Amino acid sequence: AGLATRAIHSGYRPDPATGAVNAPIYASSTFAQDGVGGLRGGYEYARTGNPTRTALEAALAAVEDAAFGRAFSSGMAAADCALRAMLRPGDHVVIPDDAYGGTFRLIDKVFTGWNVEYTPVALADLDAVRAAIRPTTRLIWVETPTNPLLSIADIAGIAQLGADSSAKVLVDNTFASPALQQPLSLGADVVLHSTTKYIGGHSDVVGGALVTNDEELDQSFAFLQNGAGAVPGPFDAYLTMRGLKTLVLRMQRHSENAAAVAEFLAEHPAISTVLYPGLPSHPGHAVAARQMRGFGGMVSVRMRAGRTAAEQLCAKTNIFILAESLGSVESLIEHPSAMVPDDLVRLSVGIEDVADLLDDLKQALG
Amino acid sequence: FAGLATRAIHSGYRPDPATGAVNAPIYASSTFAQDGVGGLRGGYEYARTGNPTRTALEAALAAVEDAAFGRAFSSGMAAADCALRAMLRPGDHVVIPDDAYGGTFRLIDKVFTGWNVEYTPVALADLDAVRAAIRPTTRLIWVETPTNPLLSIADIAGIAQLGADSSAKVLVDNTFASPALQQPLSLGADVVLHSTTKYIGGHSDVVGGALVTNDEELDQSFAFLQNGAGAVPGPFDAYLTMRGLKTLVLRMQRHSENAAAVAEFLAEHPAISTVLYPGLPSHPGHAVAARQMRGFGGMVSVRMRAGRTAAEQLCAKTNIFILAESLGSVESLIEHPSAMTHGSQLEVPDDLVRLSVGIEDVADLLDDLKQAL
Amino acid sequence: AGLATRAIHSGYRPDPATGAVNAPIYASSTFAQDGVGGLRGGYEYARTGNPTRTALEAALAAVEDAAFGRAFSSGMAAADCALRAMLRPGDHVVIPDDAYGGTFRLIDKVFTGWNVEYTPVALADLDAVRAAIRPTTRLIWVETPTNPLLSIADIAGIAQLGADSSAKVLVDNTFASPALQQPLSLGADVVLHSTTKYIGGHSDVVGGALVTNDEELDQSFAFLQNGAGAVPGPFDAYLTMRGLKTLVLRMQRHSENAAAVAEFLAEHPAISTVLYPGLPSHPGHAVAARQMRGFGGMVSVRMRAGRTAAEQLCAKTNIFILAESLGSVESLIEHPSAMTHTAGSQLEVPDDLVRLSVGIEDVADLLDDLKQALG
Amino acid sequence: RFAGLATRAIHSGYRPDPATGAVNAPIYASSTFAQDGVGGLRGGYEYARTGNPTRTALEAALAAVEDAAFGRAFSSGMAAADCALRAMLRPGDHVVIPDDAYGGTFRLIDKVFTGWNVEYTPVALADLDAVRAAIRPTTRLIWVETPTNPLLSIADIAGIAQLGADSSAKVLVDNTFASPALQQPLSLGADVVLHSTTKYIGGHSDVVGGALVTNDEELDQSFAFLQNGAGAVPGPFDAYLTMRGLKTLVLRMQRHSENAAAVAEFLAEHPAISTVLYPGLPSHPGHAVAARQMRGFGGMVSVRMRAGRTAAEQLCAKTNIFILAESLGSVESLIEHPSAMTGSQLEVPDDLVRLSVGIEDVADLLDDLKQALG
Ligand code: NA
C-alpha cells in the first residue's frame, strides 16, 4: 500500500529456491536453456533481459504506480531512448526553456542533426506551450521543478494540451522523485528518471529509467533498450534498488533541511533571491503545492554581489561539497553557469544535521 | 610493455601513486569534488562524462589494439550505435556484411532505416562486390571477420583500400578474433569495435562494448555520444572487463587449440556434413584468414547430415557444452542459430550448430560431442 | 559536528587525485612499493590494511567518538577478536544471562575448551554483577538492550565496577547502534557492533566492528585482525559505509514505527506482554532513558495463546518477513525459542515470544499487517 | 562436471540456475533468507554467516578441484589456518611445523597460540627422520607446506602422511604454492588441505580469501562450527572473484611454470646470481620428491645475489615489469626481498630475492630482469 512499503517489498520477492531477501546480483551475460522447453524464466541474454534488472524495473514501475518500467545505464540513455522511440525525422518536440543541460545538448546538438526540430517554451505559461505545438509536434518534454531554476510546470495542464493535439507528454521527475510527484496520475504518458540522483541517493551509481502505463510505448522502449544496449550492469542495478528502499525517508529529510536552508538564505543579506518551490513568493508555488507531496531538497540562490560572490560561496563551504550532480545524502553545491544567470548558486541539500549545514553556509558567506 | 600479454596486464593502469594499489580501484562515485569552480581533480567532473575506472579500461582496450584512443560502452550494441551515429547522418549509406551479427543487422535495418540511413548487404569476401556496393553517399563500410555463425572471412586490408578510394571509413567488428588474434588498425581499418561481453571479458559475466581508433577526430565524435547519450559502463563491470582482458592472450591460445581439435573430430564424424572453421585449408577464405589472423579462434560451426532434427538433438544432449546464447567464454557453449536467434541477409541453415569452444580439457569436450552425437 | 554529518563526512575525505566523493572499492590484495619498504600511504598487504577498510574504520570510529576502529568479516569475528585480545587461559568473563545466542555459543562451546571461565548474571542487578567478579575476571561482557528480551544494563554503572576491579568493559552496541547510545562516553573500554544489522541497514553485508579509545587495546585487536585474518572484503566494507550514511535517519524512523507497533500490540487481546524499552512499565526504562537518545526498532511480544499462536503470527505476516537477523529497512519477524540451543547458563527464551524488527515501511501498513495476521 | 581438472574447475562448483539458467553463481548479497513457517527453510539457507548460496558454490568448486568431499571458505588464508589449528588442537597439544614456514603461519602459531598453551617444534620437513623425532605423545598435528615460502624447499607428503598415521596425528598441507592444478595432497594421504585463495586460485591479486578441504566429514563439521562460530567468512562478491579466478587456474599455472622455468634458466647463467632455487632444476634439493608429487614445478623462483643485500634491494627497485609488492600467484609478475618484507625459524638470507613469475610474454620478463640486473 504505502509508497515506502512498496519501495521495499514490491519489485523483488524473496527467492523461492533460497529465500534471499534481496535481489541477487546476477553477473551472468547468458543463461542455460533446455533443449525441449527453451528458456528458463524467459531469460536468454543479459542485454535483452536479466534477473537483477527485472527486479529494478519492477520496483521503479511500482513507486510510480506504472504498469511498465525500463532501466538504462544513465538518465541520458533513458532520454535518448525516449526521443528515439517517440520521434522520427520530420518531427518536432516542445522543450522547457530552462531544461537540464544534458537534455538540451542532446536535442540541440544531436537530434537536430537527425532532422528533429524543437521549440523551447516557458512551461509555466500554458498558452505559450500550446502556441509552440505544430502539426509535427509528437512530444512535449516536461521538467518540474526545473534544473536549476526550480520553475514549475502544471503537468495536468500540459497533458491536456498533449491530448488535444496528439502529442505525448514525458515528464522528467528526477528532482521531485517518485516520493514527491507521480506524473502518470496527472496525465503524463511517460516518466523519466536519472536514478543517479535521488533514487540511488548516494552518488555511487549512474543509471536511468523510463516508466509508463502504455504497453506499446513500453515495447518501443524495450526495442531500443535491447537494440542499442544502453543497459545497466547488475551491481549498479542492485545499488539503485538499494537506494530506492530509503527514498521516501530520505526525501522527507531533504525537504525539511531545504526549507530550513531557504529560510536562512531568505534572511541573509548576501543573497538577493531564493529559489525554492516551498516559498509562497516562488513563482509556481501554487502549482507545486497542488502536484507535489513535498517541496524537494534543492535550493538555488542568486547572489547579491554577482558571479564572484557565487564562486567564493562555492569554494568556501566545508560540508557542502563543490561537485556536479545532486540528490545525495551529502550536500553538494555548484555554480551552474560555469559547470543561467552567473550569480546563481545551486544547493543540493543533503540529510546532514541542519545546524551544521546552516553554520557551514554562515561561515562560507562571511 | 612490448608483447601483447604484457600490455594487456600492465598498459591500462599503473599502480596508484597514493596507495600502490596494483588493480584499478572500483570508483563507485558519480561525481567528484572540485577545488574552486572548475578546479578539477585529474580532469574528473561527472562519472558519465569520464571516470577513473572506465579511463583505466579504455587505456587497456586501446593498448591491446595498439590504438591511440579507446571508448568503453555499456554493451557491444551500444558501441555499434555510437559508431553508426558518429559516422552517419540521414541521407548516408553504409555497406554491411550479408551475414552480419544479428543485433547489428537488426539495429541498422529496423532502427536506422527509419532515420533515413540506407544500407546494402554484400559478400565481403568478394572485393568487386564490395566495391560495387559503394555509392556517392556511402560513408561507412562495416566489416566483421570471421562472421557469425558461418565464420566467413573478409580481407580487412583489401576493404580498407576500397574505403580510402571512395572516402568511406572502415569499421571492423573484431569481437570473434579479439585483439589476441587480429589487429585491424594495422591493416588499415579506421575503427575497431568489440563486444567485450565475449572473449575480452571471457567469463560470461559482464556486458560491455568498446571502440578504438587512432583518429583523434573520430574519437572526439564518439566521446560526444558517449557522454551525450550515456550508454556507459559501470565501474564494477569495467573492472570485470579489465580483469577478463588480463588472460585474453592465454585463453585464446587454448581456445584455438581446443577448437582445432573439435573441428578435426567433427570432420571425421559420420553425422557431420560440413565443418566451418578458419583453420581448415578447405574453409573458404582460409588463406585470407592465415594472412590476417595470428590463430584461428575458438568458434566452430557444423552442419548436421541428418538435418534440423539432428541439430536439435545434439544441442539438447551435450553435458559440458552449455546450451545457451553468447560465445567467448571459458565454459564451452552450444547454439542452434535457426531456433535460438531471430531478403536482406543470408538464411542460416536450420541444420547448423554453432560451438563456442572453451578452455576445458579437450578429452572431455570430445567425449561430450561423441556421446551427444 | 552532528552525528548524521559525521556518518557522512568524517571517515573518507574526497580523493585528492580524482575528487571521488565516495571511498573507492580497492580490490587489490597487494600494493606497489618504491624500492624495498618504500610504502605508499602505508599500504603493503590487504589483510594487514587496505584503503577501503581504512575508510570504514575511520567512519566507525567517528560515529562512536572513538579514536580507534577495526572492521571484521562479521560481528562474531569482532567478538572472537575481542575475547582473544583480552583473555587468556585461566581468565574469566562475566556475561549477560540473556546474551545474544551467538556470543553465548562462542564462549560456552569454544572458549571453555581453551580454559576460559564465565559466569552469567542479570546485568540489571549491579550488586550481582559485582558478586560475579573473581580475581581472574578480566572482562565484563555487556549487551543492552539484549537479544531478544530487550533487558537494560546500566553501562556507566558496570563501567564503574570494571574500574574498581581492573576488568575491561565491552558493550555490544548492536541493537541500539551509535545513533542511540554511546557506550565509550559512559565508561565502556570497547564497543562492539554487528554491522550486519542496523549499521549496514539493508540485510546485504555481513560485518563486525570493535571501536575503542585505548591505543594499546586497539593494537591487541590489530594483531588478531591481521594474524587470524577475519577481515571484510572491500565491496562489503563499502556497503557498510553506505548504510552508515543513513543510520541516524533510519533509527529515528525504526524507533517511531516501533513505538507505534508496541502501543498497538499492548492493546491487542492476543498479546499478554510487550517488551519495548520505551514503555514506562518496561523494566529498565529509566536506565534506558538515561543512556539512549531513542528506544530502538525492536519490539518482542508474548502471545496469550502460547507457542502455536507465536508460530501462527510468524507464518501469517505478509509484510514482516519471517527470517533471522534484524535492523533492516524491511520488517523481520521471528520465533526465537526455535533458534535457541543453554539450560542452566542462560535464561530460557519463552516459547510464546515473537521478536519483531520493525522496519521503515509505512506504519499504517505494518499495523494492518499485524492486525490481519493476529486475527 | 566433471573429468579433467580444468573441466571441473569450470563446471563442478555451480550448475546453471534452474529458475533463470544463469551460467555463473549469482552474487547473493543477503544476510538472511525468508522461511515458510518457522524453520521452514528454503534450500536449507537461514543466515548468511552460517551458509549462503554464493559461498556454497565456491566451497563446491574448491572441494571438486582437490577431489575432496568437503570444502570450507574463509575471509583469508590466515583465517583458514586459524580455523584448522583451533579445530584440531586444544591447550596442552603440540604441532610439528616447517622450519621455514610462511611468515603469517609462524607468527600465528608462535605469537598467538603459544599463549593459549599449544606448543610446537619446527623441523626440516625434507628429513623424515627428523619429522618423526619431533613428534610427542601430545602431537596432534603436523603442519606441511611444500614448496615452502620463500626457499621453495620440498616435503614428501606421502612419507609425512605415514608418520602422522603411525602416531595418530592429522596432517595438513598448505597447498597455496603448488595449487590444485599441480599438487593433490589428499591423494597422497593428507587429512586436510589449506589454501590462501588470495594467491593462485583467485589469480589476480584482487580478492583475499582462504579454504580448507577434507574427506573427513567429522573434521569438516569441526571446521563448520568455527566458520560459523567465529565468523571469518567471505563476502559473496569476493567468493565470486575467487570462483572466477579458479576457472583459469589450470591454464594460468601451465604458463606460470613455463615462464618461471625460463626465468630460472636465465638467472642460473647470469653472473649476478649465485644460487637459483626452483623445484624444476635437477640440482634443487628435493627435486625428485617434487617430480614425484607435483604435475609441474610452479611459478615461484627465488635467487641469491652474489653482491649481497644491496644488489637484492637494487634488483627489486629496478624492475619495470615485475612489480615490487608482497603477495604472489598473480597474472602480473611480482618481486620482493623477503628478509625485509615477507632461533625458532630458518633465517631467510638477506641476499635473497623472491620472484613470483606471472603470465606476461617471457621475452619481456627476461629483458626486464637483464636491464634490472645491469
Ligand atoms: Na546487512
Side-chain angles (χ1 to χ4, degrees), chain A residues 22 242, chain C residues 194-207 240 325-328, chain D residues 29-32:
Chain A
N22 285 318
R242 201 194 198 249
Chain C
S194 175
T195 60
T196 311
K197 289 29 180 316
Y198 283 105
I199 280 170
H202 296 73
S203 289
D204 71 0
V205 43
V206 180
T240 302
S325 198
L326 50 105
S328 199
Chain D
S30 288
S31 51
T32 194

mmCIF file of all heavy atoms in Angstrom, chain A residues 22 242, chain C residues 194-207 240 325-328, chain D residues 29-32, ligand 1:
data_model
loop_
_atom_site.group_PDB
_atom_site.id
_atom_site.type_symbol
_atom_site.label_atom_id
_atom_site.label_comp_id
_atom_site.label_asym_id
_atom_site.label_seq_id
_atom_site.Cartn_x
_atom_site.Cartn_y
_atom_site.Cartn_z
ATOM 1 N N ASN A 22 17.014 -10.065 -0.613
ATOM 2 C CA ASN A 22 17.489 -9.063 -1.575
ATOM 3 C C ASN A 22 17.613 -9.717 -2.949
ATOM 4 O O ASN A 22 17.886 -10.916 -3.067
ATOM 5 C CB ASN A 22 18.859 -8.463 -1.121
ATOM 6 C CG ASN A 22 18.687 -7.470 0.045
ATOM 7 O OD1 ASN A 22 17.729 -6.657 0.011
ATOM 8 N ND2 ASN A 22 19.536 -7.533 1.054
ATOM 9 N N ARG A 242 18.793 -0.644 -3.902
ATOM 10 C CA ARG A 242 19.138 -0.398 -2.523
ATOM 11 C C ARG A 242 18.760 1.027 -2.111
ATOM 12 O O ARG A 242 18.192 1.214 -1.041
ATOM 13 C CB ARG A 242 20.618 -0.711 -2.246
ATOM 14 C CG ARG A 242 20.930 -0.974 -0.748
ATOM 15 C CD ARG A 242 22.471 -0.920 -0.524
ATOM 16 N NE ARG A 242 22.980 -1.538 0.713
ATOM 17 C CZ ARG A 242 23.527 -0.897 1.766
ATOM 18 N NH1 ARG A 242 23.632 0.429 1.836
ATOM 19 N NH2 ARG A 242 23.996 -1.634 2.796
ATOM 20 N N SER C 194 27.771 -5.844 15.550
ATOM 21 C CA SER C 194 27.468 -6.493 14.283
ATOM 22 C C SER C 194 26.962 -5.442 13.297
ATOM 23 O O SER C 194 25.777 -5.055 13.389
ATOM 24 C CB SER C 194 26.384 -7.558 14.459
ATOM 25 O OG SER C 194 26.034 -8.100 13.162
ATOM 26 N N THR C 195 27.767 -5.017 12.318
ATOM 27 C CA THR C 195 27.265 -4.060 11.315
ATOM 28 C C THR C 195 26.340 -4.756 10.287
ATOM 29 O O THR C 195 25.609 -4.115 9.484
ATOM 30 C CB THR C 195 28.446 -3.379 10.583
ATOM 31 O OG1 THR C 195 29.217 -4.419 9.946
ATOM 32 C CG2 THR C 195 29.356 -2.704 11.579
ATOM 33 N N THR C 196 26.333 -6.081 10.326
ATOM 34 C CA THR C 196 25.244 -6.826 9.648
ATOM 35 C C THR C 196 23.804 -6.349 9.928
ATOM 36 O O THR C 196 22.897 -6.466 9.106
ATOM 37 C CB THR C 196 25.328 -8.250 10.027
ATOM 38 O OG1 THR C 196 26.678 -8.700 9.870
ATOM 39 C CG2 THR C 196 24.356 -9.152 9.115
ATOM 40 N N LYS C 197 23.580 -5.837 11.116
ATOM 41 C CA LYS C 197 22.264 -5.315 11.500
ATOM 42 C C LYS C 197 22.043 -3.834 11.122
ATOM 43 O O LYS C 197 22.054 -3.477 9.950
ATOM 44 C CB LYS C 197 22.102 -5.515 13.030
ATOM 45 C CG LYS C 197 21.916 -6.952 13.461
ATOM 46 C CD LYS C 197 22.521 -7.983 12.613
ATOM 47 C CE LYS C 197 22.296 -9.407 13.119
ATOM 48 N NZ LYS C 197 22.478 -9.709 14.591
ATOM 49 N N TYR C 198 21.850 -2.969 12.113
ATOM 50 C CA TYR C 198 21.422 -1.610 11.832
ATOM 51 C C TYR C 198 22.358 -0.769 10.999
ATOM 52 O O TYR C 198 21.851 0.044 10.225
ATOM 53 C CB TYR C 198 21.099 -0.854 13.080
ATOM 54 C CG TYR C 198 19.747 -1.246 13.666
ATOM 55 C CD1 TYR C 198 19.686 -2.022 14.767
ATOM 56 C CD2 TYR C 198 18.569 -0.844 13.078
ATOM 57 C CE1 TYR C 198 18.504 -2.384 15.294
ATOM 58 C CE2 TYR C 198 17.410 -1.191 13.577
ATOM 59 C CZ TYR C 198 17.361 -1.987 14.729
ATOM 60 O OH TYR C 198 16.132 -2.446 15.331
ATOM 61 N N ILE C 199 23.689 -0.961 11.134
ATOM 62 C CA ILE C 199 24.625 -0.041 10.525
ATOM 63 C C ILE C 199 24.648 -0.236 9.014
ATOM 64 O O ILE C 199 24.580 0.752 8.241
ATOM 65 C CB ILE C 199 26.023 -0.214 11.168
ATOM 66 C CG1 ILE C 199 26.025 0.518 12.457
ATOM 67 C CG2 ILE C 199 27.192 0.315 10.237
ATOM 68 C CD1 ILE C 199 27.329 0.130 13.202
ATOM 69 N N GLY C 200 24.802 -1.466 8.565
ATOM 70 C CA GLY C 200 24.618 -1.748 7.115
ATOM 71 C C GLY C 200 23.205 -1.416 6.678
ATOM 72 O O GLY C 200 22.984 -0.778 5.680
ATOM 73 N N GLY C 201 22.239 -1.927 7.444
ATOM 74 C CA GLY C 201 20.891 -1.407 7.419
ATOM 75 C C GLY C 201 19.986 -2.061 6.390
ATOM 76 O O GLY C 201 18.818 -1.764 6.346
ATOM 77 N N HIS C 202 20.549 -2.895 5.508
ATOM 78 C CA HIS C 202 19.854 -3.410 4.325
ATOM 79 C C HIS C 202 19.985 -4.909 4.119
ATOM 80 O O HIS C 202 19.790 -5.398 3.015
ATOM 81 C CB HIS C 202 20.399 -2.690 3.105
ATOM 82 C CG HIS C 202 20.114 -1.219 3.112
ATOM 83 N ND1 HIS C 202 20.768 -0.335 3.957
ATOM 84 C CD2 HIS C 202 19.144 -0.507 2.498
ATOM 85 C CE1 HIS C 202 20.251 0.867 3.793
ATOM 86 N NE2 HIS C 202 19.283 0.790 2.892
ATOM 87 N N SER C 203 20.299 -5.647 5.174
ATOM 88 C CA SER C 203 20.443 -7.109 5.117
ATOM 89 C C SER C 203 21.252 -7.600 3.900
ATOM 90 O O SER C 203 20.875 -8.600 3.289
ATOM 91 C CB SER C 203 19.072 -7.775 5.148
ATOM 92 O OG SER C 203 18.522 -7.631 6.441
ATOM 93 N N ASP C 204 22.325 -6.893 3.544
ATOM 94 C CA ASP C 204 23.097 -7.277 2.389
ATOM 95 C C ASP C 204 24.636 -7.373 2.571
ATOM 96 O O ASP C 204 25.401 -7.602 1.602
ATOM 97 C CB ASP C 204 22.670 -6.398 1.180
ATOM 98 C CG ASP C 204 23.123 -4.953 1.284
ATOM 99 O OD1 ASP C 204 23.785 -4.598 2.299
ATOM 100 O OD2 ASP C 204 22.833 -4.170 0.315
ATOM 101 N N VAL C 205 25.114 -7.150 3.795
ATOM 102 C CA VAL C 205 26.502 -7.286 4.101
ATOM 103 C C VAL C 205 26.623 -7.829 5.541
ATOM 104 O O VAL C 205 26.016 -7.297 6.428
ATOM 105 C CB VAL C 205 27.350 -5.958 3.891
ATOM 106 C CG1 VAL C 205 26.712 -4.600 4.396
ATOM 107 C CG2 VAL C 205 28.779 -6.112 4.447
ATOM 108 N N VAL C 206 27.390 -8.892 5.710
ATOM 109 C CA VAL C 206 27.790 -9.391 6.959
ATOM 110 C C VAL C 206 29.110 -8.694 7.377
ATOM 111 O O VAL C 206 29.979 -8.634 6.621
ATOM 112 C CB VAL C 206 27.986 -10.934 6.855
ATOM 113 C CG1 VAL C 206 28.437 -11.523 8.249
ATOM 114 C CG2 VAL C 206 26.606 -11.602 6.459
ATOM 115 N N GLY C 207 29.209 -8.200 8.589
ATOM 116 C CA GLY C 207 30.320 -7.392 9.041
ATOM 117 C C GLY C 207 30.240 -7.189 10.575
ATOM 118 O O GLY C 207 29.167 -7.376 11.220
ATOM 119 N N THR C 240 28.740 -1.244 3.935
ATOM 120 C CA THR C 240 28.589 -0.987 5.356
ATOM 121 C C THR C 240 28.712 0.529 5.518
ATOM 122 O O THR C 240 27.979 1.104 6.304
ATOM 123 C CB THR C 240 29.723 -1.717 6.151
ATOM 124 O OG1 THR C 240 29.666 -3.138 5.857
ATOM 125 C CG2 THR C 240 29.511 -1.468 7.653
ATOM 126 N N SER C 325 17.969 -12.392 11.595
ATOM 127 C CA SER C 325 18.670 -11.139 11.539
ATOM 128 C C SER C 325 17.726 -9.973 11.896
ATOM 129 O O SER C 325 16.545 -10.220 12.199
ATOM 130 C CB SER C 325 19.308 -10.875 10.211
ATOM 131 O OG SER C 325 20.267 -9.863 10.450
ATOM 132 N N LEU C 326 18.215 -8.723 11.810
ATOM 133 C CA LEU C 326 17.420 -7.644 12.274
ATOM 134 C C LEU C 326 18.080 -6.380 11.845
ATOM 135 O O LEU C 326 19.188 -6.379 11.309
ATOM 136 C CB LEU C 326 17.257 -7.665 13.816
ATOM 137 C CG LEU C 326 18.540 -7.814 14.647
ATOM 138 C CD1 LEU C 326 18.946 -6.474 15.295
ATOM 139 C CD2 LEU C 326 18.310 -8.953 15.751
ATOM 140 N N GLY C 327 17.384 -5.310 12.075
ATOM 141 C CA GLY C 327 17.918 -3.946 11.818
ATOM 142 C C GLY C 327 17.974 -3.657 10.349
ATOM 143 O O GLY C 327 18.779 -2.877 9.952
ATOM 144 N N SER C 328 17.045 -4.226 9.561
ATOM 145 C CA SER C 328 16.949 -3.916 8.163
ATOM 146 C C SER C 328 15.838 -2.923 7.885
ATOM 147 O O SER C 328 14.934 -2.756 8.718
ATOM 148 C CB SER C 328 16.710 -5.258 7.352
ATOM 149 O OG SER C 328 17.031 -5.128 5.981
ATOM 150 N N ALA D 29 23.925 -11.034 -2.164
ATOM 151 C CA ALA D 29 24.119 -10.021 -1.119
ATOM 152 C C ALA D 29 22.801 -9.941 -0.268
ATOM 153 O O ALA D 29 21.983 -9.024 -0.366
ATOM 154 C CB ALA D 29 24.577 -8.655 -1.729
ATOM 155 N N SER D 30 22.634 -10.961 0.533
ATOM 156 C CA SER D 30 21.570 -11.078 1.503
ATOM 157 C C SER D 30 22.152 -11.684 2.755
ATOM 158 O O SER D 30 22.891 -12.680 2.682
ATOM 159 C CB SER D 30 20.434 -11.961 0.943
ATOM 160 O OG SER D 30 19.680 -11.281 -0.115
ATOM 161 N N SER D 31 21.863 -11.104 3.899
ATOM 162 C CA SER D 31 22.450 -11.620 5.179
ATOM 163 C C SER D 31 21.455 -12.638 5.716
ATOM 164 O O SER D 31 21.814 -13.378 6.604
ATOM 165 C CB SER D 31 22.598 -10.558 6.238
ATOM 166 O OG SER D 31 21.299 -9.915 6.317
ATOM 167 N N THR D 32 20.242 -12.669 5.153
ATOM 168 C CA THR D 32 19.163 -13.509 5.642
ATOM 169 C C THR D 32 18.198 -13.978 4.518
ATOM 170 O O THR D 32 18.242 -13.544 3.410
ATOM 171 C CB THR D 32 18.420 -12.792 6.844
ATOM 172 O OG1 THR D 32 17.594 -13.715 7.532
ATOM 173 C CG2 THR D 32 17.560 -11.564 6.405
HETATM 174 NA NA NA E 1 23.433 -6.264 6.395
#
